[PDB]
Design a protein around this ligand. Structure first.
Ligand code: CLA
Ligand code: CLA
Ligand code: CLA
Ligand code: CLA
Ligand code: CLA
Ligand code: CLA
Ligand code: CLA
Ligand code: CLA
Ligand code: CLA
Ligand SMILES: CCCCCCCCCCCCCCCC(=O)OC[C@H](COP(=O)(O)OC[C@@H](O)CO)OC(=O)CCCCCCCCCCCCCCC
Lengths: 39, 118, 165, 738, 54, 144, 80, 61
């Protein structure tokens, strides 16, 4: 389990999780606030 | 060692190559040139006549094709002359190659004129 | 107004473009049922289109001859005519989040160079230390100008240089 | 003695080596110091020969890898069936195949991408799919979404079984090397069990499920009203109502009175006229015959009993005066080298995929397929590309064998040796014939361009000027069309409409008509011959000179993949066989792009179109326009690019976006192909200085990509760009004019 | 060996077809010819300039 | 150690004949002749492509360029533990021995070799290209 | 002929010598390094300029340098 | 010069590790021209981490 957490701490897995979080956050913001251009 | 093939080491191939006029080793370069020219101009007169730009006009297709064949034979004789001037500074000499190129010019023009006289 | 541009709520090509997009959506709408899911999705599309055009007319945007919103990138002209929300507030918002990312990366690099395996902490990310620096990175402009004023933001000329210089 | 041989518990299942990147390589297990390491880690991840020298361990690794691949493919099939059941208009399409467009992908309503859900019919909105799954599912007799859902669950379960099989046969019970080396037994089991029992069980499903359901579908009865397949198995009276042969049961099979099975095992030929696909009765007879043939073929090699042939004995028996020892040593080569096997199997698998493309366009096997012009173009093009890639791969792994596994002290005066020993003659003759083909094939086009530009059309190579008719192909076509009358008496029609004959139309569209071959077809076929010969030249030269040349006498010691041997001796860039694969990849792209262009234009011009006479999609311009490059430039690319360039504001807008994106990626590749890593390394030096100035220089040192990686990135973005460009062009074109 | 190019005997002793191309390419690079001094450099550049004007 | 002589009457390895052998350079300019003595009959790899059987005793091959003889020397020296020497032969008949020109192989130091082309300085201690302008030719600053 | 030079940073590791595919370099007696060995290039007329020696040299910067010069039939690696 | 294990700073200008810091392995006490063996924790483009230097090319910093 320690080795599995080290594997999850490796670089492409963290890039995948972090870009999934960032893309989902932007997707959620563009859903609930549709089409923002200003402010 | 060299690879063995029927194509490079056949006796019929060796006799045919020894009988072709670029190989006889004791005939004159003028004679080699006129025989090679009588072969090549006679074969070269054909496709200019049959496929040239004047091929569909009567009585002038053969004239224009033979005239273009004679022009190409003149270009080939100039090519032979400058090849000899570059390469050599009996067939493989300066005087011998100049004799061979003049013989090719004469034999090629004769072969074109005999392919017309047809 | 600015640069000969009319406001979008006054512009006529803006209203023509709104009417044209509604016309295309209702020509696509008129070949289905009423309670069907394509009709529901197209009515949601028309609702979002009307809401978008109303919001852009409400925000005071400037339209041209084509009926399209134009942005003003000049701090004084934007702050004078009420257009700081389109370039000026977005550029300071971007600079805040971009310096956030850069300062958290720089603090992670300085934290992992002080061990016996900096490349190992670069390949396999130290997640508690990375989350610690990611939460502490909110005071990055204050921390950056303090590290500037102490002379510790910058390395001296112990850098790698070529033969020429 | 053929038997099961297995080692118990060789490799422990543990997450430890997941946490140690590059564990498999002694070099890469040291850790990263520069960025090059990462790339190496992914490049050498699956090169199992460079991991261990033990053939057994390598063989086990490839076995479990193959299981992983099969599990991935099963996940993919599961996905296709599930999306076909839940997010499609398949039932509506079943009720009206001629006026509903197959769609099985829907997009969510965010950021305006909702417009991609277009009006495909059936009260549905989505992206029209061109994989041909709907036609496959109708041909298989599927009628409801429930059956597709159950197929999805089944495929997912099978994927879990495949990944368990991988884990099991690597970590728990891993086969021994002498198990893997039982190639005679492997051929027997794969020819009998796989191909044989595969086509037998499929013929079973066809005869018992496909034929009645599709007979009713062609009769016109509502799919929901059609009896479920299990009722067809259960009550043989219904089977006897449709085909009275089934009344007599399996008595004519065992009593050898097979003629009474003519109701469902036919030899009609042609296409089903109300449906535009091959007769399923012909397909059933075909799979029964194929089954019996392969089950006969699978009992050829000796295993645990005296009967049966021996592969090494058949190889060592064929020796002549011209070739010396003949096929001696080839058995030893093909039972110890995975790369040789991969070369052979890739070559025939690619060629087979190209044959699949041609035979599936020419003899449409699925119902309502020939008139789904987008599906036809997509399938042909796709399988042609896959084919070409596998051929290039064959050349690659042939060369890899030549460098790593070739050992002449077991391979001495042999077929392979003599090929190596007269390679200069081989390459020089191939060289000459490539130049000859290039000059006369391309020169006719340049000649035509010049004559057309000079206002002298009577001097062109065309059907009205100087004609170059494909007399041989026309003769073969005519013979094929006249075959049912004399040389195939039991055939009611020719095997394909393209030979000649009448015209089969479905829903007002042309399914297939006779294809005529003229001067333009002559010219494109010789272009094809030229490009294929050049590709063969590059790849074959790569494999024949992989070990040595007059330039690099000891090239074998430098490996398969290496940049060069320095700027000396005039310059030795791209001397490696890998670099020959790299150039062969570009030439393969060239060849297959002209092939798919030929197919697209020829079909749209002389085959496809509506029936009122037939009005073709491009009016029949091929025969007069496909003799000049300007003709291809204007009448094909420029003319048919209208649909892609004006696809904005509609459901096809994604094809415009991917048109532009693909152009961009193609161009982006040129930076890597045209440049070199010295410049980039120095640029990175300056940037590294800038990062050092701000204390942000990474501990893993930024390095420019290697020479070979620059070439690899280059060719990959080049292929992706070009192929995706033609993809967007094709799909937008054929969907809008289809 | 051969005469062309006269400005470089290192290229004139080349037995390959590289000699013709490199004689074509290094012809107007007067700073790297055989026996070139500085006065000769400026004088040949002056003559070439007149050629450009003509 | 004395400089050995070429025996042209030395038996050659068993080889069926490649297309990658000699050309007109061997007849006009030069070709090289490699000679070794084997302990047993054994198959090796020809540098021009193909396989060949070396004889038991004196062997003799002839190649076009020098790197072919070096490649066969490296193969016979690291794979078979043999000691070959290859010569340079002209169409006159002039025979030029080399490798090992000292008799001892160049990968180990031998007393009596004169050091050639040795700059007694660092590479960073070279002059600038301005200091070597307008000599009789193109010069690099490392030539002086 | 290509210009091959040896510089005094040589540590006599013999790597360049065993990397040259042409037998151009050799090791000579010397006193400047602990190995008491120095490289030398007495046969640069046969040098093709492949730079395997430079790839094999460990020192930073290089102790063997190949300056590509005028081409001959031996330096172009021609067999014809 | 410097003792074993101490940190120096490289001032050979064409070195890869010029203006950077390494660690002394040994200093040879013969008449060798470049006796100071310095190891570096990062590799050059050749993948080498060790180089000989002179006494006036290293500064104990
Ligand atoms: C690099 C140039 C560039 C710029 C300046 C923009 C800017 C924008 N895009 Mg565009 N776009 C781009 C490239 C760019 N994009 C590219 C390359 C693509 C193709 C992939 C797109 C495809 C695209 C689509 C499909 C959409 C946009 C949208 C937008 C708007 C998003 C506003 C938002 O996300 O809410 C605000 C976001 C936040 C507040 C998140 C930040 C969180 C921090 C904490 C805020 C801190 C503030 C203090 C914004 C104007 C949307 C739009 O409607 O345009 C009008 C939209 O639907 N973009
Ligand atoms: C990137 C370069 C740039 C350029 C070309 C402009 C251009 C302009 N600025 Mg802007 N400005 C900029 C950046 C720039 N700005 C920045 C970074 C700031 C924040 C410091 C401002 C703050 C600002 C204010 C408060 C005002 C302008 C104004 C203007 C307009 C007239 C002034 C002029 O011609 O000066 C040429 C511009 C420069 C040499 C760049 C430096 C800008 C300085 C810092 C401010 C200049 C203000 C100026 C003295 C006010 C003139 C009043 C006007 C009625 C005559 C002109 C369109 C004025 C306006 O609204 O006109 C209608 C105005 O009141 N700018
Ligand atoms: C799930 C439980 C499990 C665990 C803990 C292990 C553990 C191990 N395996 Mg085993 N094995 C398993 C199941 C498991 N295996 C399965 C299901 C298979 C069949 C594929 C195998 C077949 C197998 C082989 C052939 C080998 C191993 C090896 C190993 C050892 C090292 C491998 C490693 O660290 O890389 C971890 C690997 C990864 C984290 C990558 C997973 C790759 C999958 C298949 C990716 C598929 C993704 C797909 C392509 C989507 C991509 C989309 C797009 C982004 C491209 C390690 C002890 C190796 C060994 O023992 O060497 C001495 C070895 O050679 N395993
Ligand atoms: C696409 C199909 C596919 C298949 C069948 C494999 C199969 C394998 N990969 Mg590979 N891999 C792939 C794609 C694939 N890979 C791709 C596209 C890349 C990026 C280039 C890699 C990068 C990669 C690396 C770096 C490594 C592997 C390794 C392996 C082996 C160990 C996998 C394992 O034990 O985990 C078992 C898998 C599971 C238990 C299920 C997967 C679950 C994960 C978390 C998702 C196994 C033979 C390892 C290896 O070769 O060891 C010698 C290894 O170190 N792969
Ligand atoms: C008649 C029995 C039989 C059948 C049907 C197969 C079928 C297959 N083998 Mg072969 N194999 C067999 C006997 C058989 N084998 C024997 C006796 C040997 C030893 C001489 C081998 C040695 C062998 C090796 C080394 C490899 C194969 C591989 C394959 C697969 C090729 C991929 C493909 O295109 O299939 C299409 C895909 C399908 C038809 C999917 C259905 C597959 C299921 C599992 C049915 C196949 C029957 C299977 C043998 C039963 C296993 C039961 C198990 C619980 C004990 C295919 C599934 C390759 C492979 O991919 O490994 C994973 C491979 O590398 N086989
Ligand atoms: C290869 C695949 C395949 C399969 C699976 C079938 C299957 C079938 N066909 Mg056939 N068929 C096929 C190919 C196939 N066919 C081909 C290629 C042709 C063309 C020649 C035909 C032409 C044909 C005709 C004309 C007819 C059939 C019929 C049948 C059905 C009955 C046959 C029978 O009596 O078998 C013999 C019986 C068995 C094999 C018994 C199976 C063994 C049992 C299940 C073992 C159970 C043991 C276990 C211990 C007990 C259970 C315990 C448990 C409950 C706990 C059966 C569904 C008949 C039919 O019903 O049509 C609708 C029929 O009239 N077929
Ligand atoms: C237009 C683009 C283009 C063209 C014309 C060529 C042409 C050629 N390639 Mg090249 N290639 C290309 C792109 C191109 N390539 C690119 C982008 C790459 C990078 C991947 C390559 C990489 C590559 C490889 C790896 C190989 C080739 C080879 C060849 C030659 C094939 C032999 C042949 O067909 O001779 C026939 C000549 C032609 C088809 C050229 C047109 C000739 C015209 C029609 C007639 C000429 C008469 C002329 C008008 C008279 C002029 C008179 C005037 C001077 C006064 C041919 C010269 C191959 C080769 O040389 O082996 C034989 C080979 O192996 N190329
Ligand atoms: C490359 C392929 C190719 C071919 C086959 C042709 C063919 C032709 N051209 Mg075209 N042309 C081409 C490329 C080609 N061209 C290109 C690239 C350009 C642009 C530069 C042109 C521009 C052009 C112009 C402006 C014209 C032509 C014309 C013609 C026609 C007359 C040519 C002629 O009379 O030559 C003379 C014939 C020969 C020189 C024959 C030599 C070749 C022989 C037959 C090979 C035989 C080898 C033999 C089998 C070996 C046997 C060995 C054994 C005995 C031992 C002919 C149909 C003319 C025309 O009007 O046509 C209607 C014309 O005016 N062409
Ligand atoms: C004031 C004008 C001027 C003068 C007096 C010079 C003088 C010189 N230049 Mg400089 N230079 C100039 C402008 C000038 N240059 C311009 C405008 C460019 C950008 C193109 C350059 C870029 C440049 C480079 C990169 C180099 C020089 C070099 C040189 C030196 C040698 C020239 C030589 O030997 O090449 C001989 C010239 C050729 C072999 C020309 C080949 C033909 C070229 C590639 C164009 C081909 C296109 C073709 C004509 C189109 C035909 C179309 C067809 C359909 C008809 C000489 C000192 C060289 C140097 O100093 O070396 C150290 C050198 O490497 N120049
Ligand atoms: C014609 C080729 C006959 C080939 C043929 O009949 O070979 C037959 C000949 C028979 O050899 P043996 O009878 O000794 O072979 C015995 C065993 O090795 C094979 O069972 O094979 C050779 O001698 C090799 C010579 C290859 C010569 C290569 C010529 C290649 C020409 C390529 C042109 C192809 C054009 C059409 C392509 C579709």
């Amino acid at each position: 389990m320690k080795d599995f957490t080290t594997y999850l701490s490796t670089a492409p897995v963290i890039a995948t999780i972090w870009f999934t979080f960032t893309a989902g956050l932007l997707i959620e913001i563009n859903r609930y606030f549709p089409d923002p251009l200003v402010f | 060692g060299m690879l063995e093939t029927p194509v490079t080491s056949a006796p019929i191939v060796a006799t045919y190559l020894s009988n072709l006029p670029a190989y006889r080793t004791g005939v004159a370069p003028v004679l080699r040139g006129v025989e090679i020219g009588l072969a090549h101009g006679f074969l070269l007169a054909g496709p200019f006549i049959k496929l040239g730009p004047l091929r569909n006009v009567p009585e002038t297709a053969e004239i224009a094709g033979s005239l273009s064949a004679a022009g190409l034979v003149l270009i080939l004789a100039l090519c032979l002359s400058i090849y000899g001037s570059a390469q050599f500074q009996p067939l493989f000499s300066a005087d011998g190659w100049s004799e061979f190129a003049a013989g090719f010019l004469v034999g090629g023009e004769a072969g074109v004129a005999w392919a017309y006289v047809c | 107004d600015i640069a000969g541009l009319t406001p979008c709520s006054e512009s006529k090509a803006y209203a023509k473009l709104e009417k044209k997009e509604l016309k295309t959506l209702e020509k696509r709408l008129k070949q289905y049922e009423a309670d069907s899911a394509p009709a529901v999705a197209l009515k949601a599309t028309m609702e979002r289109t009307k809401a978008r055009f109303a919001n852009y007319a409400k925000a005071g945007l400037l339209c041209g001859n084509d009926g399209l919103p134009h942005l003003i990138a000049d701090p004084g002209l934007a702050l004078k005519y009420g257009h700081a929300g389109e370039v000026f507030i977005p550029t300071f918002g971007f600079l805040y989040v971009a310096g956030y990312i850069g300062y958290v990366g720089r603090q992670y690099l300085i934290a992992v160079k002080g061990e016996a395996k900096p490349t190992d902490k670069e390949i396999i990310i130290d997640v508690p230390l990375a989350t610690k620096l990611a939460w502490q990175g909110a005071g990055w402009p204050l921390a950056a100008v303090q590290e500037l004023q102490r002379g510790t933001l910058l390395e001296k000329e112990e850098n790698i240089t070529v033969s020429p210089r | 003695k053929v038997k099961i041989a297995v080692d118990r518990n060789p490799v422990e299942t543990s997450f430890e080596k997941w946490a140690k990147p590059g564990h498999f390589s002694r070099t890469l297990s040291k850790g990263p110091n520069t960025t090059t390491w990462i790339w190496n880690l992914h490049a050498d991840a699956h090169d199992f020969d460079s991991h261990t020298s033990d053939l057994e361990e390598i063989s086990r690794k490839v076995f479990s890898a193959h299981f992983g691949q099969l599990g991935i493919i099963f996940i993919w099939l599961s996905g296709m069936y599930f999306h076909g059941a839940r997010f499609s208009n398949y039932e509506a399409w079943l009720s009206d195949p001629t006026h509903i467009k197959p769609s099985a992908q829907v997009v969510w309503p965010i950021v305006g991408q909702e417009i991609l859900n277009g009006d495909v019919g059936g009260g549905f909105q989505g992206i029209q799919i061109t994989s041909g799954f709907f036609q496959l599912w109708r041909a298989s007799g599927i009628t409801s979404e429930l059956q597709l859902y159950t197929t999805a669950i089944g495929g997912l379960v099978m994927a879990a079984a495949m990944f368990f099989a991988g884990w099991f046969h690597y970590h728990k019970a891993a086969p021994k090397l002498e198990w893997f080396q039982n190639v005679e037994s492997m051929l027997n089991h794969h020819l009998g069990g796989l191909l044989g029992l595969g086509s037998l069980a499929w013929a079973g499903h066809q005869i018992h499920v496909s034929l009645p359901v599709n007979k009713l579908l062609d009769a016109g009865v509502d799919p929901k009203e059609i009896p479920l397949p299990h009722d067809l198995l259960l009550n043989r009276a219904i089977m006897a109502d449709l085909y009275p042969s089934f009344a007599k049961g399996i008595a004519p099979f065992f009593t050898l009175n097979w003629s009474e099975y003519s109701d469902f095992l036919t030899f009609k030929g042609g296409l089903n006229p109300v449906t535009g696909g091959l007769w399923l009765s012909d397909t059933a007879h075909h799979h029964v015959a194929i089954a019996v043939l392969f089950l006969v073929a699978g009992h050829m090699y000796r295993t645990n009993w005296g009967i049966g042939h021996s592969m090494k004995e058949i190889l060592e028996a064929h020796r002549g005066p011209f070739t010396g020892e003949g096929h001696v040593g080839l058995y030893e080569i093909l039972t110890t080298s995975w790369h040789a096997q991969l070369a052979i199997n890739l070559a025939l698998f690619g060629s087979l995929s190209i044959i699949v493309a041609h035979h599936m366009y020419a003899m449409p096997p699925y119902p309502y397929l020939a008139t789904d012009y987008g599906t036809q173009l997509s399938l042909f093009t796709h399988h042609t590309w896959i084919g070409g890639f596998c051929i290039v791969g064959a050349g690659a792994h042939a060369a890899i064998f030549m460098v790593r596994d070739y050992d002449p002290t077991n391979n001495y005066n042999n077929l392979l040796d003599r090929v190596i020993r007269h390679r200069d003659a081989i390459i020089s003759h191939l060289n000459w014939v490539c130049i000859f083909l290039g000059f006369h094939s391309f020169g006719l086009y340049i000649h035509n361009d010049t004559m057309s530009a000079l206002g002298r059309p009577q001097d062109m190579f065309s059907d009205t000027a100087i004609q170059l008719q494909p007399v041989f192909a026309q003769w073969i076509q005519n013979t094929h069309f006249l075959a049912p009358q004399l040389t195939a008496p039991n055939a009611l029609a020719a095997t394909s409409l393209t030979w000649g004959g009448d015209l089969v139309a479905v829903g007002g569209k042309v399914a297939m008509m006779p294809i005529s071959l003229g001067t333009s077809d002559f010219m494109v076929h010789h272009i094809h011959a030229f490009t294929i010969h050049v590709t063969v030249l590059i790849l074959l030269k790569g494999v024949l000179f992989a070990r040595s040349s007059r330039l690099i006498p000891d090239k074998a010691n430098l490996g398969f993949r290496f940049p060069c041997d320095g700027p000396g001796r005039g310059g030795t860039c791209q001397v490696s066989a890998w670099d020959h694969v790299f150039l062969g990849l570009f030439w393969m792209y060239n060849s297959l792009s002209i092939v798919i262009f030929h197919f697209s234009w020829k079909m749209q011009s002389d085959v496809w179109g509506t029936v009122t006479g037939v009005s073709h999609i491009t009016g029949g311009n091929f025969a007069q326009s496909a003799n000049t490059i300007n003709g291809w430039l204007r009448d094909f690319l420029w003319a048919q690019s209208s649909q892609v360039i004006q696809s904005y504001g509609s459901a096809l807008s994604a094809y415009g976006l991917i048109f532009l994106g693909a152009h961009f990626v193609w161009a982006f590749s040129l930076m890597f192909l045209f440049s070199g890593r010295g410049y980039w390394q120095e640029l990175i030096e300056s940037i590294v200085w800038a990062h050092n100035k701000l204390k942000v220089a990474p501990a893993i040192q930024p390095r420019a990509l290697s020479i070979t990686q620059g070439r690899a990135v280059g060719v990959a973005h080049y292929l992706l760009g070009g192929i995706a460009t033609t993809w967007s062009f094709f799909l937008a074109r054929i969907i809008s004019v289809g | 060996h051969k005469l062309f190019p006269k400005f470089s005997q290192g290229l004139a002793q080349d037995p390959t077809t590289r000699r013709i191309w490199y004689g074509l390419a290094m012809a107007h690079d007067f700073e790297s010819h055989d026996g070139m001094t500085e006065e000769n450099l400026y004088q040949k550049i002056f003559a070439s300039h007149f050629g450009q004007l003509s | 150690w004395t400089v050995p002589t070429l025996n042209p009457d030395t038996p050659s390895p068993i080889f069926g004949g490649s297309t990658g052998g000699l050309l007109r350079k061997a007849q006009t300019e030069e070709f090289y002749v490699i000679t070794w003595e084997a302990k047993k009959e054994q198959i090796f790899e020809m540098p021009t492509g193909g396989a060949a059987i070396m004889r038991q005793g004196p062997n003799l091959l002839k190649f076009g360029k020098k790197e072919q003889c070096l490649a066969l020397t490296t193969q016979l020296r690291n794979k078979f533990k043999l000691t070959p020497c290859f010569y340079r032969v002209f169409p006159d008949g002039k025979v030029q021995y080399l490798h090992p020109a000292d008799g001892v192989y160049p990968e180990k130091v031998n007393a009596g070799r004169v050091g050639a082309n040795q700059n007694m300085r660092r590479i960073g201690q070279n002059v600038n290209p301005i200091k070597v302008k307008f000599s009789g030719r193109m010069m690099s600053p490392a030539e002086i | 002929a290509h210009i091959v030079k040896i510089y005094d940073t040589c540590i006599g590791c013999t790597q360049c010598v065993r990397a040259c595919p042409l037998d151009v370099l050799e090791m000579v007696p010397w006193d400047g390094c602990k190995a008491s060995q120095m490289a030398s290039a007495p046969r640069t007329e046969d040098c093709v300029g492949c730079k395997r020696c430079e790839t094999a040299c460990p020192t930073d910067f290089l102790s063997v340098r190949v300056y590509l010069g005028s081409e001959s039939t031996r330096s172009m690696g021609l067999s014809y | 010069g410097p003792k074993r294990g101490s940190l120096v700073k490289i001032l050979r200008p064409e070195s890869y590790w010029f203006n950077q810091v390494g660690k002394v392995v040994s200093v040879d006490q013969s008449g060798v021209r470049y006796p100071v063996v310095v190891r570096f924790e990062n590799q050059n483009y050749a993948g080498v981490t060790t180089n000989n230097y002179a006494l006036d090319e290293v500064v104990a910093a």
